[PDB]
Design a protein around this ligand. Structure first.
Ligand SMILES: CCCCCCCCCCCCO[C@@H]1O[C@H](CO)[C@@H](O[C@H]2O[C@H](CO)[C@@H](O)[C@H](O)[C@H]2O)[C@H](O)[C@H]1O
Ligand SMILES: [Cl-]
Ligand SMILES: [Cl-]
Ligand SMILES: [Cl-]
Lengths: 428, 428, 428
């Protein structure tokens, strides 16, 4: 399949991104658990108790039973509103983290995809290098037979074909592990992909660096998260400061008490005290609580929260600095990648006419086969180095979007258009 | 010493593995602390108090003294049985983690051991390469004297010996740091080891990949741990759900109260109220508590626990995917390693007869010393590349067992048998 | 600017080190929050309550109001002293961590600085290599015109200049990203730096290894922290053991109760019970609490704390082992670095006279231009490899200081003296 189709099938299955989602999903649900203390708490208690008097109570015994429907309600507790506020903020943070992890699926799928396309290019060039050496070995072994080439030109040539044989070997390996890379990320094995359409390919220059930098400062997810986090440390300072405020709660019960006495000093007290009591109370009440001095625990908590804010801020500076260097390095690299595709584009042309020369030269006395092998080897190196450099440009366009924070599905859709030929991932 | 003896000495001292053990030891003991709330709690409290009445109590004062032997007992508290259950599970997890760390000691000891054997092979070859160039330099300097070799053949040859001199230098360094690696891991320094017996060496083909894969899915420790962890997230969902259940505890005291009054309105009240009281109560009782509505805190806690379970599951998928690619890549690599030992086995033969030729050639005009140097350099490269590839196969056999989850002492015992010659780790 | 001036400007702005500082600052302030429970806690509570009787209380109603100024004071609570003790210890640990991070700013600033100096050296050599090939190409293209040089000597020579052209390209990239590295760390961009004064340069042999090792065992920060941490685990064992001790607190209130009754069975009870009560109590009291059996929670907690200590100890052994290998490897490396600056110092001399020869040789028939290019290429490689090796020696001097735990500003001040020539970071 093409880039799109691979990516899309990975979107639905990546246990890396699916976990990041379950983390986002929990953090948002946990807002609910944070809101809960601002709502009515409603419990039910029943307490059986048997007392047995001794000393000045030797002979007074009781079997008591109570039950109640208790209700609590926060009426003014700033600290509980703050927790709600923080859980919202943490959830927002988790969402930027998901946003970031979404992008990482894109960059990682593209990368593995091209790393396969390359493992393929490398193989097929290494096979063409092998095959080309064989034919040059069978003209250097049908000219040695005829006397006009030294035996050490054939021992060298055979030792050199044996190397391209061992190279073809650790080339498929590289390829095979590449599709294993792709499977882990993607969940699948592909019999064929779709390689970079070679003639229909031009590099597009990058936007000025100062524009990319400015766009990144508005939308780069690492930066947006450092900001949300500084925001969290500041709300956390208020939280420390809430421990100075007073709290007003409401309570309301409906209880039922059923005591009954026994023993000896109950057998004629006749004060109708030790007579069965059957109470029932409806209550509603307000507790007010004000902290006044707590060993200075509140102030130390506040100071801590403030250093935490400095730290959150330093972390933020670290973030701009990272976005700066990432956005620049990333611009720098796409430029060096364009100027590289150009140089290798020409070194292939050179390596080609340089080979063509020493094939004519060798079959007619002029230059050795060890002139023709090198010139051949040299060709296929520029051949590889080129197609490799192309892929890096493609992946470097994607890094620029990541550093920007805009890396999305469309960046993949466009890149899809620039490849077409279905290539096998398991060449015979 | 041999592989075995090194490993074994490291088993007894590795502070990496010894810590992992202390972690396992603590998690298991912590089961005890988790069981404790299901047992009887037994405290002792005595409270002296002095009251001093004012307002409608101006003149009523009291000095009271109480003490009690309190006892609590969980009778039905599902949440406390759950914690016990979870600490058992966490202990199990810690033990799979120790199991994993045990293996890592094995892979790490073997790796360092061969990294030394290689630093040694590389040195001794680099010494033989040095020594061989010296003798070829003293035949090219006893033929230059006699006129029939250009001075630039000797300037080239001396500049080239100078390089093998600098190579011998940054070869012994590599070696020395390798024994430092080994010491950190192992606690010791070895004057000699035991290198890979070179003639008594063949490669053994690996088991089919589909068999390894199937064996790994049953025993691979990383996988077993993802599973124990999914299990934990599920028990954790039940824990969230326990917050709907009621709790029944028992309590039992034996108190003693000693109040005594004073002030002015005690000096003739003659109601025998403000008379010294001396109580003593034996109690036993049952508290029952049922939550009814808690702001929906219990449900949000349950939903959270559920997303955690989704995540624990995605994590598990991630684990299969890792076991797949590890087991394949690892199979792939041992194969490419066998086919590699073969190719280098032959390139050494080639490089050898190719040298032999150009030594005869150079001492009789035919080929330069710059033909003889390269051919020599080339040999020693195959010489190294070979013994190096051998070690990689050995270490790759061990990676399969790790991916399998079976890496153990016997895998080392067998590998021990395939080495014998005691080699110095500090060559003069 | 020079090394000093860069470093110093980074000291004032590094958000990596400024964060580490905010972490240290908080840990120390948090001692305050740990001391607080040992001080007086002073609150204020007022509780309005309305009761409404039913059953044996049908017709008894009350509106009650209370307020109090409560005070608590730990009189003997070992656990609270221990917390204070641990927070002190944690703060100490955070400070060793800051000490470590301080050093890392130094090593990291120096490294980036020299990595720029090197990206510069490499560029300027790559430019001199380019420029030298051009002139040799324009004598091989004004001798081909005159017939006595094959065309394949010019196709080879142009393909080889094209390579140094592409090398110059991915050289000024390397450089540009190096200053980006430097900016992230340092906060600035420098138009010029100051490179290693090349003639005024000698290597200084290192102190014997056994001395460095002994010095490191006394002052290496990683080791000091492992020790401080072992100390924490042991204090943590005492903390576990404190759960067996009894606790004695003091309390003091000044309350005010204002009950008032209503309903029907209050309308003539005439027992002056349901008459407005107006209490007021001054209290002072001592609570004593002794744990006796807590399900063996205290003992399991202690055993756990003890395994933690074993782990903290194993961790410590891991630390010596790390300091050993770091101090040795680091000594080893500076020596191989000296012996390296020497070998490359000579290979440049060789590569120079070897070039000089084959420039005379080629302009007068003797050796090809493909003899003159290689010999040239070879010179500039030793030229680079040399200046590169020099920097590594500088940075390796700094690693010894880190492994020692003495890396400080003076180590930089001295290194500053050994450079002087202001070099541009943006060569045209
Ligand atoms: C003689 C040496 C003894 C050394 C240790 C002394 C400790 C005190 C004795 C405690 C008795 C053991 O308690 C026993 O342990 C296992 C572990 O839960 C329980 O087994 C159970 O465990 C978990 C709950 O905890 C459940 O999910 C499980 O399905 C269930 O089988 C038994 O229900 C219980 O009866
Ligand atoms: Cl306070
Ligand atoms: Cl609820
Ligand atoms: Cl106990």
């Amino acid at each position: 399949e093409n880039l799109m189709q691979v990516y899309q099938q990975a979107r639905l299955s990546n246990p890396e991104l699916r976990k990041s989602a379950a983390d986002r999903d929990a953090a948002f649900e946990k807002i609910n658990e944070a809101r809960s203390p601002l709502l009515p708490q409603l419990g039910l208690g029943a307490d059986y108790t048997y007392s047995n008097g001794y000393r000045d109570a030797n002979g007074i015994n009781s079997n008591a039973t109570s039950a109640s429907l208790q209700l609590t309600q926060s009426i003014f507790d700033m600290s509980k509103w703050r927790a709600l506020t923080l859980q919202e903020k943490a959830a927002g943070i988790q969402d930027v983290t998901y946003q970031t992890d979404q992008q990482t699926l894109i960059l990682n799928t593209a990368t593995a995809y091209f790393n396969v396309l390359n493992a393929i290019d490398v193989l097929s060039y290494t096979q063409a290098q092998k095959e080309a050496i064989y034919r040059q070995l069978d003209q250097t072994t049908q000219r040695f037979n005829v006397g006009l080439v030294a035996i050490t030109d054939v021992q060298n040539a055979r030792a050199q074909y044996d190397t391209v044989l061992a190279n073809e070997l650790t080339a498929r390996n590289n390829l095979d592990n590449a599709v294993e890379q792709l499977r882990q990320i993607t969940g699948n094995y592909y019999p064929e992909l779709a390689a970079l359409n070679v003639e229909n390919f031009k590099t597009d220059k990058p936007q000025p660096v100062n524009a990319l930098l400015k766009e990144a400062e508005k939308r780069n997810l690492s930066l947006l998260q450092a900001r949300l986090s500084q925001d969290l440390a500041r709300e956390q300072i208020r939280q420390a400061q809430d421990g100075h405020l007073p709290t007003l709660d409401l309570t309301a019960s409906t209880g039922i008490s059923d005591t009954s006495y026994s023993g000896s000093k109950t057998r004629g007290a006749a004060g109708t005290q030790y007579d069965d009591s059957n109470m029932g109370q409806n209550k509603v009440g307000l507790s007010f609580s004000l902290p006044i001095y707590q060993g200075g625990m509140v102030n130390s908590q506040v100071k801590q929260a403030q250093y935490n804010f400095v730290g959150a801020s330093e972390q933020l500076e670290s973030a701009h600095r990272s976005v700066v260097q990432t956005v620049r390095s990333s611009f720098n690299n796409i430029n060096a990648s364009i100027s590289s595709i150009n140089a290798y584009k020409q070194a292939v042309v050179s390596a080609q006419s340089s080979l063509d020369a020493m094939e004519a030269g060798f079959s007619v006395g002029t230059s050795t086969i060890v002139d023709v092998l090198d010139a051949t080897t040299t060709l296929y190196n520029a051949k590889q180095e080129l197609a490799n450099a192309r892929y890096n440009y493609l992946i470097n366009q994607l890094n620029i979007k990541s550093a920007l924070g805009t890396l999305n599905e469309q960046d993949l859709l466009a890149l899809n258009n620039a490849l077409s030929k279905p290539v096998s991932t398991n060449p015979e």
